[PDB]
Ligand binder design. Sequence first.
Ligand SMILES: Nc1ncnc2c1ncn2[C@@H]1O[C@H](CSCC[C@H](N)C(=O)O)[C@@H](O)[C@H]1O
Ligand SMILES: Nc1ncnc2c1ncn2[C@@H]1O[C@H](CSCC[C@H](N)C(=O)O)[C@@H](O)[C@H]1O
Lengths: 374, 392
Amino acid sequence: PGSLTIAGSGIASIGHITLETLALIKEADKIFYAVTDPATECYIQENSRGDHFDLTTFYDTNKKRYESYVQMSEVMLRDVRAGRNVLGIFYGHPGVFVAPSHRAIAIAREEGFQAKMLPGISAEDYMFADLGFDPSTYGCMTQEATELLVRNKKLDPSIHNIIWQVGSVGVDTMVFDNGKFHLLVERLEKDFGLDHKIQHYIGAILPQSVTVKDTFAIRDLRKEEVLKQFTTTSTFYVPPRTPAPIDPKAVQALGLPASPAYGPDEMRAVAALDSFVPSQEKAVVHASRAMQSLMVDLALRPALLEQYKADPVAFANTRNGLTAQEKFALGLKKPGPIFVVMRQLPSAIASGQEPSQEEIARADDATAFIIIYI
Amino acid sequence: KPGSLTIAGSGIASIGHITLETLALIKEADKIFYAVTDPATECYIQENSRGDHFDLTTFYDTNKKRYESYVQMSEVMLRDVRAGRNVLGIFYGHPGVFVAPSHRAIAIAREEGFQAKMLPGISAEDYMFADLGFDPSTYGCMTQEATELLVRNKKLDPSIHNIIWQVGSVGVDTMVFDNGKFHLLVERLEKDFGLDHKIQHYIGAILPQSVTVKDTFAIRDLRKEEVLKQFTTTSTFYVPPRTPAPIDPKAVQALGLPATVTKGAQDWTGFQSVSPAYGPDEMRAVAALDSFVPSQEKAVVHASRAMQSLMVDLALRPALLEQYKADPVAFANTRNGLTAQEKFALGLKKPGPIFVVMRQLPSAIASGQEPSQEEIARADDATAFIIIYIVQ
Ligand SMILES: Nc1ncnc2c1ncn2[C@@H]1O[C@H](CSCC[C@H](N)C(=O)O)[C@@H](O)[C@H]1O
Ligand SMILES: Nc1ncnc2c1ncn2[C@@H]1O[C@H](CSCC[C@H](N)C(=O)O)[C@@H](O)[C@H]1O
């Protein structure tokens, strides 16, 4: 009867919370949260039904963090076992560099309860936006500073590297003095050399915060005045030193063919813009108010989504503002039909021509989603 | 009336992944340019907007270079910025992950002296961690595109988590999306992991009607016709570690960690050996829970309505944030519900003072003792935030 949902608050105070998460906060029976700033904390409390618990109460200066984490999981699990519909909220993404979330979800499931995790905005998400790089260009390795040292890993200088928790190297309690930071520096020196530059990143949590994105040569990382800047909030971005060369054999096997802002190619693209006409008519959105209302409700109201999934035809029949085609599409409970009814050709719209049941039902689920990784 | 450019994401799931700051900007922006994957998200953007919007996907066409399309996408945004409009661009997922026109527009805007910002959104990777239930930190996590992995002749490291994007269209974009080169990725997987190792095929649900795909396949299976048929343009692979590196006791020693550290942090997916949920160490922590008393009294949130109202406003209203930043003292003086202490803290425009006025000891609250101006001003920014949720 009890259940567990664990969601995130993101990084920036209030702004990074997702719409589905705010909806959960408003409806939940009980909220356990671990956030980093008072404005976010207050915002969660004030939007809630008023039954909440601060998970950070389990930390202590010289207490092993592992003990705190087990306790955080346990208070959530106790309420699940008691039959509450429990929401956990963790700073950032609740599954990224978080021990108690995955633990609680696994244990809940093992014991036969419904449990799920929702994504949130992570520190890496914030970093890509703030530092303005695309991880897909060379590939991107994520690692925790202590973990990489305890397992004697080497960093690959051909890719993007992101190193988290640089401010807590070798610490298992809550005392952070940078006493072992020099061990990470040694790793960096060996893998990248002394002249390679890294970026020290701290994304702005409060309005009063200023984004930190300072560059430091590795040769400067043992300086007292540099060292002092690395806190428990700090992440390092280490750009590639030596991207791996293209292999022409691989390119060929893949069937692939063998800077100024406004070069000739760009100037051509711009000149052609105002007159460009597609080779074929593109569909535009064409959805009734009823359809839009329903689709928003299904996105933001779990109770309604549950009812829809249990009996889609019946649920469609509760929204009589839907067109006949919309009702049919919704009754099928498949993604493709939704695309067919909600997006139509302007030529057909002008002709009063509604999509046929054949057109609706024939929709391919797989290739309805247009992703040309822009 | 200077133009400005903000690029945001829609996230992956229809509507629900949009961030509060993003919705706020949808409502307030002069003009919105968007490229999203589903019609419910598209309609939601339109219906919440000031009604001036443009679908960037209109620039796509067969026999048209994608790059030309991207330059045009950047240009329509920049034109409106130059004209003095408050411009919002929105892309599927996170707008900086596999999106070329976003980075380009921001760079040019900044070069020409405009304020230009990217906002994070929920990525496919983010959705995967939540749906498949692993943490990149436990073993480390390498994320890369299938074609690029092959083109640069990279090896997959079997000791870490691996995420592979774009498995559904190896070696070709286009629209034909015939996965005729997929076997080259399978070869790579076979070489690095062997045939018996298991991968997960992941598709996160976009629409309410979508069902999450999280099927496990042995690498042996990836050549089977009934398996190949499953892979699509929204497919991602998760490859769990096969051979994680052991904890080095000498490294543990050098790090000053106790000799009791013999294992990394726990992964719960079932791909790794999974310790009992309630072993002796866990039972100890649970038994200690009810009677735990911290070494020193902990502060609790304690903030005025005026302070909370202001802090929400600054998070959600860029024009107000701009005003505050320009003159924090004058701004605080427009909110006379603030205490003298709050006004002072806000005037410093630093995070550390905020913690002093927005959190207080329950003992100090009971006695009615307010924090001193000296206490507020001496607050250390570098130790205000406590952010640590894993350990070895
Ligand atoms: N504001 C911020 N700027 C940069 N890195 C940050 C940050 N907040 C957290 N981090 C990173 O995250 C680590 C704490 S663990 C926090 C993880 C959180 N669930 C998330 O999704 O991000 C820090 O040591 C640092 O490496
Ligand atoms: N619904 C979905 N589920 C799983 N992976 C997805 C997905 N949609 C896209 N992807 C993955 O994402 C790759 C790039 S498209 C998505 C890019 C988006 N900016 C983001 O933040 O993630 C695809 O090739 C695929 O591997």
